[PDB]
């Protein structure tokens, strides 16, 4: 039920893009194949997504941030910010590091990151 290479979890198709890109390049790459950088809304979705990110659980971009107004988090896929997994000392909430990166540090958790940093990414389409 997903296109070749994409992986199904509860009605949504996901793809890991290993190419290291800034957040906007990563979003554009998802969009070229009809997708967005992913959102996360449950523990099971989160585990499924982590399992796409190589054995290394590579630090990766998600489709979230607070880049318009600090502390106001939004996803790119029309869903709301509900579930989060902030690392200790996150989020900073500063506009200079406003894009959400997952798989950060030993704890494999979220950190609001300068959007120009280069990371792999997770795309999703439903
Ligand atoms: Ca941060």
Residue numbers in the entry: 3 to 128
Give verbatim lines from the article.
Type II AFP is a 14 kDa globular protein composed of both α-helices and β-strands with five disulfide-bonds. The Ca2+-dependent type II AFPs have been identified from Japanese smelt (Hypomesus nipponensis) (jsAFP), rainbow smelt (Osmerus mordax) (smeltAFP), and Atlantic herring (Clupea harengus) (hAFP). The obtained data revealed that binding of Ca2+ does not affect overall structural motif of jsAFP but alters its side-chain conformation as well as its rigidity of the Ca2+-binding loop, facilitating a formation of the polypentagonal ice-like waters on the IBS.
The overall structure of the Ca2+-bound jsAFP is composed of two alpha-helices (α1 and α2), eight beta-strands (β1–β8) and four loop regions (L1: C69–W75, L2: W77–T81, L3: C89–Q92, L4: D94–E99). The molecule is further stabilized by five disulfide-bonds (C4–C15, C32–C125, C69–C100, C89–C111 and C101–C117) and a hydrophobic core composed of aromatic and aliphatic residues. The obtained docked model showed that waters 1, 3, 4, 5, 6, 10 (cyan) as well as the side-chain oxygen atoms of D94 and E99 perfectly match to the waters constructing the 1st prism plane, whose RMSD was less than 1.0 Å. The B-factors along the sequence of the Ca2+-bound jsAFP (cyan line) is lower than that of the Ca2+-free form (orange line), suggesting that 1 mol of Ca2+-binding rigidifies the overall structure of jsAFP. Indeed, the IBS of most the AFPs tends to be hydrophobic.
